[PDB]
Design a protein around this ligand. Structure first.
Ligand SMILES: CC(=O)N[C@H]1[C@@H](O[C@H]2[C@@H](O)[C@@H](CO)O[C@H](O)[C@@H]2O[C@@H]2O[C@@H](C)[C@@H](O)[C@@H](O)[C@@H]2O)O[C@H](CO)[C@H](O)[C@@H]1O
Length: 160
């Protein structure tokens, strides 16, 4: 567990989980290959009835629909658009009272933990084909090597 790192932008090295620790509901982080994937994760607090919320994604205000029917778990939602003028679309969610999410660049992909703790797992990915894909995090984060995926899984499901 290398960190915390302060919010920043980076060419996230391949084969590291970026375990992100946001402070509260809102945008958490964005990333892109600049070609055909612009992705973002947002965090929704417990007890949110279906609604639109405004996020600044790719520099622009976007109204996205969110909900969280848990009274204890936060919900991370992973949104992806495929072109600059496209639509950010929900692909995956992670429900967790421990407030942590993680993604990793590996195998020409970005892997992402999804499901509901305490058996969330790294079962979603998108294809990026760009090992220099850039990530900008508004939150503190940690780096965990892929060799220690089992530990990242432990932290996702139980906190630090
Ligand atoms: C958004 C993105 O980059 N998608 C890739 C991705 O899509 C896969 C992947 O998300 C896995 C994760 O478990 O789930 C599916 O296999 C998904 O496949 C895509 O979506 C489904 C609904 C089908 O329409 C399928 O034909 C489609 O490929 O990886 C694939 C390669 O496996 C592509 O690279 C997508 O663009």
């Amino acid at each position: 567990l290398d960190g915390p790192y302060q919010p920043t932008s980076l060419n996230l090295p391949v084969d590291y989980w970026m375990l992100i620790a946001p402070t509260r509901e809102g945008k958490v982080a964005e990333g892109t290959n600049t070609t055909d994937r612009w992705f973002a994760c947002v965090l929704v607090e417990p007890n949110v009835q279906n609604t639109q919320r405004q996020y600044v994604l790719d520099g622009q205000n976007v109204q996205l629909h969110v909900s969280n029917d848990s009274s204890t778990s936060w919900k991370f939602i992973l949104f992806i658009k495929l072109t600059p003028d496209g639509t950010y679309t929900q692909y995956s969610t992670l429900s967790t009272p421990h407030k942590l999410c993680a993604w990793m660049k590996r195998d020409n992909r970005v892997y992402w933990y999804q499901g509901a703790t305490p058996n969330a797992s790294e079962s979603y990915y998108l294809t990026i084909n760009n090992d220099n894909s850039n990530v900008s995090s508004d939150a503190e984060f940690y780096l965990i090597p892929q060799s220690q995926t089992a530990m990242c899984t432990q932290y996702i499901n139980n906190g630090l």
